[PDB]
């Protein structure tokens, strides 16, 4: 089995309407050739596939976040990005990365990130 590492960056506070990167990295090369999706979750409730994209850049995301949110990878940088626009207050949540989900379905698959806090005003 493969070893994914990854790593998460990208958290802040930013006021409603204000914007957020976050970023997804793992140095093993399959990292590319994966579906790496965005979970987050609220504290006590259960973690939501809210954005994903597909090896080749096919993108899907959650209903509350279209329009808002794009999700973007550079396979050069071996890097997954999660562009959050117009972000709201229900947007607070911690945000973790998630490598080889599948997307229609939203089943994680094995390699998570350490989670990143995401706080709106």
Not at 88 to 107: H, Q, R
Request: charged share 15%.
């Amino acid at each position: 089995m493969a070893e994914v590492q990854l790593v998460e960056s990208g958290g802040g506070l930013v006021q409603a309407g204000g914007s957020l990167r976050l970023s997804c990295a793992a140095s093993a090369s399959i990292f590319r050739a994966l579906n790496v999706g965005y979970y987050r979750q609220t504290p006590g409730r259960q973690r939501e596939l809210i954005a994903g994209i597909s090896g080749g850049g096919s993108t899907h995301y959650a209903d509350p976040v279209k329009g808002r949110f794009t999700i973007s990878r550079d396979n050069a940088k071996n890097r997954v990005d999660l562009q959050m626009n117009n972000l709201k207050p229900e947007d607070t949540a911690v945000y973790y990365c998630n490598a080889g989900p599948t997307l229609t379905t939203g089943d994680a698959g094995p390699y998570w990130g350490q989670g990143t806090q995401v706080t709106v005003s």
